[PDB]
Design an enzyme around this catalytic site. Structure first.
Site, PDB file in Angstrom:
ATOM      1  N   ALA A  87      39.880  60.804 -58.232  1.00 20.54           N
ATOM      2  CA  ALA A  87      38.721  60.673 -57.386  1.00 20.54           C
ATOM      3  C   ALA A  87      39.030  61.163 -55.966  1.00 20.54           C
ATOM      4  O   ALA A  87      40.151  61.185 -55.532  1.00 20.54           O
ATOM      5  CB  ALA A  87      38.296  59.210 -57.343  1.00 20.54           C
ATOM      6  N   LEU A  95      37.600  59.730 -43.331  1.00 26.08           N
ATOM      7  CA  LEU A  95      37.137  58.897 -42.242  1.00 26.08           C
ATOM      8  C   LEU A  95      36.240  57.807 -42.830  1.00 26.08           C
ATOM      9  O   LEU A  95      35.281  58.096 -43.541  1.00 26.08           O
ATOM     10  CB  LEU A  95      36.389  59.790 -41.243  1.00 26.08           C
ATOM     11  CG  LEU A  95      35.848  59.020 -40.046  1.00 26.08           C
ATOM     12  CD1 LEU A  95      36.932  58.284 -39.266  1.00 26.08           C
ATOM     13  CD2 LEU A  95      35.153  60.000 -39.094  1.00 26.08           C
ATOM     14  N   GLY A  96      36.581  56.551 -42.512  1.00 27.79           N
ATOM     15  CA  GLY A  96      35.801  55.415 -42.901  1.00 27.79           C
ATOM     16  C   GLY A  96      35.548  54.493 -41.709  1.00 27.79           C
ATOM     17  O   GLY A  96      36.153  54.630 -40.665  1.00 27.79           O
ATOM     18  N   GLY A 144      35.820  50.784 -40.230  1.00 25.51           N
ATOM     19  CA  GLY A 144      36.456  49.481 -40.326  1.00 25.51           C
ATOM     20  C   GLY A 144      35.483  48.352 -40.013  1.00 25.51           C
ATOM     21  O   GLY A 144      34.522  48.537 -39.243  1.00 25.51           O
ATOM     22  N   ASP A 182      35.549  50.253 -45.057  1.00 29.24           N
ATOM     23  CA  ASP A 182      36.707  49.431 -45.340  1.00 29.24           C
ATOM     24  C   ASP A 182      36.352  47.958 -45.092  1.00 29.24           C
ATOM     25  O   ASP A 182      35.979  47.598 -43.987  1.00 29.24           O
ATOM     26  CB  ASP A 182      37.897  49.812 -44.441  1.00 29.24           C
ATOM     27  CG  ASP A 182      39.123  49.001 -44.824  1.00 29.24           C
ATOM     28  OD1 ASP A 182      39.729  49.302 -45.857  1.00 29.24           O
ATOM     29  OD2 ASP A 182      39.428  47.996 -44.087  1.00 29.24           O
ATOM     30  N   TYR A 219      37.755  38.996 -44.088  1.00 35.71           N
ATOM     31  CA  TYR A 219      36.995  39.284 -42.869  1.00 35.71           C
ATOM     32  C   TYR A 219      35.740  38.432 -42.755  1.00 35.71           C
ATOM     33  O   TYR A 219      35.151  38.384 -41.657  1.00 35.71           O
ATOM     34  CB  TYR A 219      36.619  40.782 -42.787  1.00 35.71           C
ATOM     35  CG  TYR A 219      37.791  41.724 -42.800  1.00 35.71           C
ATOM     36  CD1 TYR A 219      39.093  41.315 -42.587  1.00 35.71           C
ATOM     37  CD2 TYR A 219      37.580  43.085 -43.046  1.00 35.71           C
ATOM     38  CE1 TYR A 219      40.151  42.197 -42.636  1.00 35.71           C
ATOM     39  CE2 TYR A 219      38.627  43.982 -43.114  1.00 35.71           C
ATOM     40  CZ  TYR A 219      39.926  43.541 -42.916  1.00 35.71           C
ATOM     41  OH  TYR A 219      40.965  44.446 -43.012  1.00 35.71           O
ATOM     42  N   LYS A 249      39.765  44.320 -50.494  1.00 35.53           N
ATOM     43  CA  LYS A 249      41.144  43.886 -50.578  1.00 35.53           C
ATOM     44  C   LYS A 249      41.196  42.457 -51.117  1.00 35.53           C
ATOM     45  O   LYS A 249      40.375  41.603 -50.712  1.00 35.53           O
ATOM     46  CB  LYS A 249      41.844  43.944 -49.213  1.00 35.53           C
ATOM     47  CG  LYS A 249      41.501  45.211 -48.413  1.00 35.53           C
ATOM     48  CD  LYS A 249      42.343  45.367 -47.157  1.00 35.53           C
ATOM     49  CE  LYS A 249      41.829  46.480 -46.254  1.00 35.53           C
ATOM     50  NZ  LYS A 249      40.607  46.078 -45.500  1.00 35.53           N
ATOM     51  N   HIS A 264      46.005  43.076 -50.262  1.00 40.02           N
ATOM     52  CA  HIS A 264      45.882  43.147 -48.805  1.00 40.02           C
ATOM     53  C   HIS A 264      47.250  43.058 -48.097  1.00 40.02           C
ATOM     54  O   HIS A 264      47.481  43.767 -47.112  1.00 40.02           O
ATOM     55  CB  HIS A 264      44.927  42.034 -48.350  1.00 40.02           C
ATOM     56  CG  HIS A 264      44.288  42.235 -47.008  1.00 40.02           C
ATOM     57  ND1 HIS A 264      43.024  41.726 -46.776  1.00 40.02           N
ATOM     58  CD2 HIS A 264      44.747  42.826 -45.876  1.00 40.02           C
ATOM     59  CE1 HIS A 264      42.767  42.035 -45.505  1.00 40.02           C
ATOM     60  NE2 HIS A 264      43.766  42.699 -44.951  1.00 40.02           N
TER      61      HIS A 264
END
Ligand SMILES: NC(=O)C1=CN([C@@H]2O[C@H](COP(=O)(O)OP(=O)(O)OC[C@H]3O[C@@H](n4cnc5c(N)ncnc54)[C@H](OP(=O)(O)O)[C@@H]3O)[C@@H](O)[C@H]2O)C=CC1
Ligand SMILES: O=C(O)COc1cc(F)ccc1C(=S)NCc1ccc(Br)cc1F
Ligand SMILES: [Cl-]
Length: 316
Positions: free
Chosen positions: A11, A16-17, A19, A44, A49, A78, A111
């Protein structure tokens, strides 16, 4: 530059992602909506979180709105440390899927290498203060991750904050079924990570750079800590290129064949941080940025430093 990198599962992953650690729950839905509207295709996330429901509201709205198709998104989450138990991994993944409003993740990471005692607390402590470990090792947790691929819950699995002997342990696992696709680690000009990056890249693992701006919103920031965004040497490279310092800090890992995941909840900055595909840093710029390494970590998981699987006592 090409916008996606090919992973060892076949894949493609956007380089660029966005956060989402520290993104407030009352701001992150709009942040992710804006991000998708301005071109981000990679988010991400993590259960720890505490904002995956709100991230999911945004993703779902943009899918419903047909701004994007699910196949065009690359959603990462994660497995938290208190779910390193063969019997807890699937349910942790499924809770993340339910919160994100998804039926699969593109990538699911361990993680941290360290397993903690299960329970409600994310950092279970003994009466004296130290993290209470789990006896489950990185190899049994990896096997549990592999099952998620085979059940269709995740398209790729990987690791985060693994040092090279921990990556090696994974790669040397008896009966290994799926190699890690990604190792997500802290990386920026003050913690340039050359040794771990070369190890991982030599093994075909893609590296994602976290805290690429030096995490100025980290909760433990001290005034006397170094500041990437204010470093006049970096500002000068930015000025030369008619870009912002943040844009240089984002482009830097991209040109090292890394994925990078800057966080913002500020709409103007979300857009700014995406405008990194229309300039190139020279090799001299790159080497100059690398020269700023000082082995400085945002994320050192300092409560866990006696855990037998604590990652940062090893050189790399
Ligand atoms: N696997 C792991 O263990 C870890 C993973 N991560 C991941 O990496 C992501 C990024 O790292 P993170 O530690 O959040 O920190 P970053 O290095 O991405 O810095 C985020 C901070 O920079 C600010 N900022 C963003 N863009 C700009 C800009 N253009 N100009 C000025 N300031 C800017 C943000 O402000 P504002 O939001 O107010 O705009 C915020 O305060 C995390 O959110 C998380 O997704 C991070 C740490 C550990
Ligand atoms: O972890 C994050 O993604 C971003 O940071 C966090 C994000 C959270 F939502 C909660 C705690 C952290 C911390 S305190 N992380 C550091 C950390 C945790 C565990 C171990 Br083992 C070492 C270590 F250095
Ligand atoms: Cl998590």
């Amino acid at each position: 530059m090409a916008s996606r990198i090919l992973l060892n599962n076949g894949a493609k992953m956007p380089i660029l992602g966005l956060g989402t650690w520290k993104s407030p729950p009352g701001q992150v839905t709009e942040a992710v909506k804006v991000a998708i509207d301005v071109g981000y295709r990679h988010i991400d996330c993590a259960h720890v979180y505490q904002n995956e429901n709100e991230v999911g509201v945004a993703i779902q709205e943009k899918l419903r709105e047909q701004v994007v198709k699910r196949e065009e998104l690359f959603i990462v989450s994660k497995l938290w440390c208190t779910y390193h138990e063969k019997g807890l991994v699937k349910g942790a993944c499924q809770k993340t899927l339910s919160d994100l409003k998804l039926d699969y993740l593109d990538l699911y990471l361990i993680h941290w290498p360290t397993g903690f005692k299960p329970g409600k607390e994310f950092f279970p402590l003994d009466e004296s203060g130290n993290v209470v470990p789990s006896d489950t090792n990185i190899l049994d947790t990896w096997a549990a991750m592999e099952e998620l691929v085979d059940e269709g819950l995740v398209k790729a699995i990987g690791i985060s904050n693994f040092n090279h002997l921990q990556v090696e342990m994974i790669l040397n696992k008896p009966g290994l079924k799926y190699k890690p696709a990604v190792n997500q680690i802290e990386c920026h000009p003050y913690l340039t990570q050359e040794k771990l990056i070369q190890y991982c890249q030599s093994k075909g693992i893609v590296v994602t750079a976290y805290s690429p701006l030096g995490s100025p919103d980290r909760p433990w920031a001290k005034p006397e800590d170094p500041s990437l965004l204010e470093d006049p040497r970096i500002k000068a490279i930015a000025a030369k290129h008619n870009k912002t310092t943040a844009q240089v800090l984002i482009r830097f890992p991209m040109q090292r064949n890394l994925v990078v995941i800057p966080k913002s909840v500020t709409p103007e900055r979300i857009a700014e941080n995406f405008k990194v595909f229309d300039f190139e840093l020279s090799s001299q710029d790159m080497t100059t940025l690398l020269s700023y390494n000082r082995n400085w970590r945002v994320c050192a998981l300092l409560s866990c430093t006696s855990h037998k699987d604590y990652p940062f006592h090893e050189e790399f």
